Structures are given as C-alpha cells and as structure tokens.
Design a protein around this ligand. Sequence first.
Ligand SMILES: Nc1ncnc2c1ncn2[C@@H]1O[C@H](COP(=O)(O)OP(=O)(O)OP(O)(O)=S)[C@@H](O)[C@H]1O
Ligand SMILES: Nc1ncnc2c1ncn2[C@@H]1O[C@H](COP(=O)(O)OP(=O)(O)OP(O)(O)=S)[C@@H](O)[C@H]1O
Lengths: 73, 293, 367, 74, 74
Amino acid sequence: EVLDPEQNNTFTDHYLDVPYDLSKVFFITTANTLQTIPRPLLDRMEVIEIPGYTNMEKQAIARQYLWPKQVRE
Amino acid sequence: QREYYLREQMKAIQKELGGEDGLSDLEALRKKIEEVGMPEAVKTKALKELDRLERMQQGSPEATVARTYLDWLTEVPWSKADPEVLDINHTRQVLDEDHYGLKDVKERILEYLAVRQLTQGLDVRNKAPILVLVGPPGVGKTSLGRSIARSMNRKFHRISLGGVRDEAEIRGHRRTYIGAMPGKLIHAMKQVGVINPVILLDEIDKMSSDWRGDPASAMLEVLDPEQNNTFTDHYLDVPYDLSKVFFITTANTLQTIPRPLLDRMEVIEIPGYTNMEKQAIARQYLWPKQVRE
Amino acid sequence: QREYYLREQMKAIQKELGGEDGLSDLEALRKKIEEVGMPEAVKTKALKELDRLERMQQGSPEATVARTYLDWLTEVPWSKADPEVLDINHTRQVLDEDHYGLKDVKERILEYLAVRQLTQGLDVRNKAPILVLVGPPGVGKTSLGRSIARSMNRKFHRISLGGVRDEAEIRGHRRTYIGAMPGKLIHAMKQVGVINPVILLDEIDKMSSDWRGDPASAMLEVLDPEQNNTFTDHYLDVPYDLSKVFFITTANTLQTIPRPLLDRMEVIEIPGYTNMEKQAIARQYLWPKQVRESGMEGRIEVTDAAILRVISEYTREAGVRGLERELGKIARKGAKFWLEGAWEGLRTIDASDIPTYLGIPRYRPDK
Amino acid sequence: QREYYLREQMKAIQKELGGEDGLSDLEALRKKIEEVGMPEAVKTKALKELDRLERMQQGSPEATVARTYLDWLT
Amino acid sequence: QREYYLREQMKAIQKELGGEDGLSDLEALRKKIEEVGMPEAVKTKALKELDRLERMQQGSPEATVARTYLDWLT
Ligand SMILES: Nc1ncnc2c1ncn2[C@@H]1O[C@H](COP(=O)(O)OP(=O)(O)OP(O)(O)=S)[C@@H](O)[C@H]1O
Ligand SMILES: Nc1ncnc2c1ncn2[C@@H]1O[C@H](COP(=O)(O)OP(=O)(O)OP(O)(O)=S)[C@@H](O)[C@H]1O
C-alpha cells in the first residue's frame, strides 16, 4: 500500500483514520538480491543494478576517496 | 395550563444553567431519529437510550458514551440509496473509456444492469454481486473497481486488507471501553452516504491467519450471500444489512484464501495480455500519459 | 451553591413530574416485578436494590446504574415457554419442505423428539444433545437451524462465533464499571421471548484466543448440561437457567475444536451430494429462486439433461453454491437476450444450448 | 470546608494563570486546526472530535486519547 | 461493651438510611468464621480481611474482590 505508484494518494494506517498522501516522497530502497522480495512488491519498484567494481576503478576510488580519508583520520 | 406551567419552571431552571444544549439538541436527536429510516427494533432501543441520556448532566462521563453511541447510530445510513442507471449504452461507453479489453468483467456489469432493468418493482430479492478478480501482478484489477463505480454512478470506497491481523479491525470493540469505535465496514458505510456503495477490498489473499489473530474467519458473515442482511458489529449491537453492497475483491492466487471463504465469491479470471493487446494499451493509454507527465 | 439550589428545585420538580415521580419508579417497577413472575432470591435482591433506588436522587450517576440493572432484570424471561409438539408426522412434513435428502440428520431430530415425548416422568431425561454438524462448505448446515426451529414451533436466534476473541462477549462485565452490558447469550435470551429457543452457535471451530484467556473456557460453562442450569454472567449477579435451550453448532472440521468441548458433543457428519441429489435440488430449489430474482419467469426453462450437463461439465465441488452461480449465470444471459429482441412463449434450454450461455466447458466428461 | 476552599482556590488559579491562559489549550488548538492546510474531509473530522472533546472532563482517561489524536492531526 | 456500643451506633445510623440491619452482613458473618475450622493463623487473617470491608464503599470493585475472597475462604 505504501509503494503502489497509483494508489498511495490515499494511504491509511490504523491510528490515523484519514487518507494521507505519500505521492511526493522520493523512496529509495536498498537490497542485495532480488530472490527474497515477493513478486507483487518487486513489480512496483524500478530496478537499478550496481554490479561491482573492476580493478582500475578500484584504483581510482582508492586514490581519490579512500586514502585521503584514511590519512586524515 | 398546570403541566406546561411546570414546563415553564423546568425551562427556567434549564436556561439559568443552560449549556446551549441539554434541551437545544437532545430534541434535535429526537427529531433526527424519527425522520431517517431505522427499522422498528432499532428505533425502539434508540429512543430507549435517548430518554436515558437526558438525566445525565454532562458532568456525566457516561453521557459522552451514550451520545457517541447515538451519533454513530444516526449517521450510519438506513434506507437511502442511489438509483440504478438505465442507459446501458452510456455505461458501455464509460467502461470503454477507461480500459482496453477485459470483456468478461464488462459483460458481468452489463448483465447486472440488464437484470436491474427488468425488475422495476416486483417484490423480489435484490442481491448485489460479490466478486473476486484473480490474475498476474501487473494487470489492472485495482483501477477497474473505481472505473466500475464511476460507470454505474455509484459511490466508491477502498479498504486494504494486506497485512491486517486482528479481528478488532473488521468488527469493533464494545461500547464499554474508553476509545472504542466500529470496524472498517461501518466506518466505510458512514463515509459513503448511501446503502449502495462499491466497496473494493483490496487484497483478500494476504490477511494473516493463526491462533493469535484471524480476521479471515470474521470476513465470513460479511461476504455470506445468504446471511449478511443481519451483520452484527460489536460497537453497534443492531443487525445491519450489507446485502445491497457491491463488493469487489482482488487476489493474485487462490491457494492462500481459506476454503469456506472462497466459495462465497464469484471468481473471474484475468489471464494476462498478448502483444497486440499490449500494443493497443501502449498506444492509447500509457504513452500519452508519460508524454504529458 | 447557586447551581446546587437550582437543581435542588429541579429535583423538587421531579417530585411532581406527574404530581410525583413514583409512577415512573416505585410504581413503574414494583408493578413490573410481579407482573412478570420471578423467583424468590432474585426477588429479594431486586427489592433490596430498589430500596436504595428509592432513597437517592434522580440524575446522579448512582441511580442510573441501579435503574438500568433493574430494567435489564425485569425483561429477561422467567418461566415462560412455547408448547411442545406431540405429532412427529407434522415435524417430518415440515422438515421435508425446506431441504432434500439429509436423511440421517432429520431422523436424528425425530429420534430426539420421540425420546422426549416418551419420557416425562423419570427426570434424568430431557438433556438435549449438543449437536455438531460437520461437512464441506455449501451443504445445508446453517439453513437447517431455521428449518429445525420452524419444525418444532420454537423461536430461533443465530450467534456467529467466527472471529470472537474477547471473553467479554460470552459472559459480560460487572455493573460497577462506567459502561456495562451483559453477554451475548443473555442478550439473545432477551431477544426471544421464551425460555426454550433454538440457538445456533455458528462456527465454533474458529474461535480465537488471546491473553486474559480464550472464550472456549467460558463457552464450556454454558454448553455443559450439568452446570448450565446455574449459568452466571457478571452483569447479572444471579444464576440463570439455560438447560431448556436446544443448541445447534456447526463446523467444517473436528481437529480445531477444543477437547473439553468434543467430549460433550454428538457429531453428525454431512457427506456431500451426488449428481442425482444435485439435480433434484436444482429442480426443486435453486432454479426457481434464480429465475424469480432475474424477472424471467414464464420466459425461459431448462431440461433435466441440461442441468446434468451443468453439474458434470462446469462444477467440481461437494456443496451447491457453484451450481446456483451457474444457474444464475444462465438466467442473467437470458435477461440480457430479452432486451435485445423479445420472443413469445418460453424457450427451453437444451443440453446442446449450454455453451451459448456458459462458454467453453472447463471439465471433460468420461467416455 | 477548608479543602473545599483549597480546591476552589486552585481552580481559580488554573482558570487564570497570567491575565488569562485558562483557555490557551483548546483555543490554541482551534487556531492551529485552521492555520494548517488540511483537506476539508479531515477538517470536518477534526472539528467534530474537538466539539466532542470540549464537553468532557479535563484530565479524563477518555480526554487524553482525543487530545493526543488531535495533536497527531495538527 | 465498646464493641456493641459502637456497633449500636452503627445500627442506629444504618436504621434509617438502610431500614435496620442492612445486607445481613457485617455482624454475623463475623460469627460464621468461628463455626467452621480453622487454624488460628487463618482465623486472624480472615478477621483482618474481614475488618477491611467494614468502612469500604459498597458499589466499588475492590470490595467485591474482598467480598468473594472472604466468602470463598469461609
Ligand atoms: N487494459 C488496460 N487499459 C489501461 N490501463 C491498464 C490496463 N491494464 C492495466 N492498466 C494500467 O496498469 C496499471 C496497474 O494497474 P493495477 O490495478 O494497479 O494492477 P494490479 O493488478 O491491481 O496490481 P496488483 O499487484 O495485483 S494490486 C494501472 O495504471 C492501470 O491503469
Ligand atoms: N439439500 C438442500 N436442499 C436445499 N437447499 C440446500 C440444500 N443443501 C444446501 N442448500 C442450500 O445451499 C446454500 C448454502 O447453505 P449453508 O447452510 O449456508 O451452507 P454452509 O454449510 O453453512 O456453508 P459454510 O461455508 O459452512 S458457512 C443455502 O442457500 C441452502 O438453501
């Protein structure tokens, strides 16, 4: 009910007996596999797969982000 | 002369300690009970508990309980209804404006209207359908409910039963308790103004069911096609008829519905679309929507 | 002190509602208490609570509690019963008008009536059996309650126990609370006017438990025929007799009924219907009521072979809700065909015209 | 009579703290219930709950539920 | 003497707001304890939970708990 992209204009919990509007809120959900998400819940979300890094972009991350941070701390 | 002079004295005592109520709106409740619906046993017990509020004094914490019971009892509709639409062609037009395909559901609605045309007063039973729409996760069977409700010129209200686990959400709590009020059905019948709504029960196959909470066995006598004209709440203790309510329920599978609840409902399969149907849906419903937005 | 003075004059006016408030109380209820006919200990408790409903003033929150407890104690039936039937042939003829088949249940009811009519002098008898109807969904369990109650010329009341979780529905709350109502059983006894109704307790196998106990423990008190003659709720502080009530209960399976309840019950199983039984109850019961409700009577009919087609090739069940949904579908299609051009007389639906009305068959017959 | 005068004194204290302040509670909630941009179908429920609240007892076990509900709405 | 003097005052007040001995309680269920059993520790405990029902309000929930307790212990 909270992630339905057509019907979350009217979300109703049990304490507030009124419909509340959740259509403007930017949801970002995080997972690490898709197999344990039930199929009606997976259909409501847009998938973006982040694959894992190669060695030269690991070098770029280590030069530009990780090593100055570990030096300052 | 003497008895209405006695009324003059009690009026003097009342308005010198008047609350702008206690004689200003108790008799408004007296007028409002008698003018709206309310079969005879209900109005007898209602006037019985109306004449035993007047000697509470608000300054009576049980005066709140009785007045809120009366205001749940008078604002739930009794015999107020929307007419049936006779233009079956106009209903066909409005159903074709919203969705592509889906001939089975549309023919079900048009046959309901054809039956309601041939009964223009015959003293027969008027029993509204109880449906379950079953299909794959993407096929539109939630938007179809309010498309039906707009095409028939009826009122619409949606209830989500997706994670509901307690029985106090279908029926209420008793009037004894501090903050009690009825279940979602009586509240939905109060939000809607009539006795002919289209109530979408959003997913009927996802209710929790164990030895510590099973609402799926309290949905029996809500969806019973023979006995839901005497549905009894726990807050209201009068029998209240739900036999005129057009209930549409939705599910993705039939295996997780309890078997005494499944055969209460007429099952309409919605199978999933072919490539020509998806091309037509994409041409005249989805692409103009995305281009506008 | 002004407002004390003012409703002091109001209660002095209440001494002269009609020249007195007595007719509404000491003379309302003192007339109503022996107008009914009530036992002696409850008469003692009623008189020596009207003794202090006498003394107090109206309006104050200690008089409304006592007055509602006196009003609820006056309108519960004490020693008033419907007459007993002495002709079991009339009971057999009434039971055969509402249902078809179901021979063992009907003859068990006739055995109970014969036992109670032959035995009215030894005073161990006349404990009514706690009947349990067990079967698949769709067989006539719930309808037999009203059919049996019409057969014995008694009054009927149905209580649904499908999702009852609180124990305060069976046995109520004490009348010292700010809101106070009795249980559902004594409310049902107020609904009927007699001491011997037929109470249908529907779906006893589906009661839910909670903390503060489960309502099966409170249900065991009323449904045990050796302790239900002194049944005590908490609203009424007195024992009440519920031994003359004929209880009928329904269930779908036995494995979820509590063990101290199954030891006091006599199960009667309803097996499910064969095809000849299904077409008999479709000729006699389902098809006329599906044609009346469509407004198509005198305009469309169906043969026996067509009903056998509908049973064999479109249903797989034990009950008959699906069969009447199919017959209602045929009546709807006829009602829609009527509006797009009428006919005279009545057309008769044959077994070769069924796929026009119901579509492609969904089960294949054996050959 | 002494403690009657005591409770009557403290009731006189609470009905005017500074100049007024006796009714800053429900009148401030009446202001706040219309300063926010609620839909009308929620405003009707809120005003009916507040009118049902204003007859009650200040400090009842049945008043704090309604006041907490109105606070969650505001 | 002081027992039936102060209870004589109990009687003389309860006679008009109660029409003579009220409820048959409060003097002779005091005598029903000595005619059944009992160990003396049980007897003094019964007298202690008996004498707390003396002035406590009739129509209150705690009194009924104490009432059924001393009636079932009897
Ligand atoms: N035939 C159709 N014509 C037009 N729009 C359609 C059609 N079928 C589906 N849609 C659209 O598809 C979307 C999904 O509809 P939903 O009713 O939400 O599907 P749903 O089956 O109810 O999802 P769940 O997971 O089963 S609750 C909606 O925006 C519909 O408008
Ligand atoms: N032998 C029969 N003769 C006539 N009508 C019957 C017969 N058996 C069943 N029916 C009808 O079948 C319908 C279903 O009856 P019910 O008693 O409500 O079923 P049920 O056994 O109570 O089902 P559940 O799921 O346990 S509530 C009613 O309309 C009955 O009139």
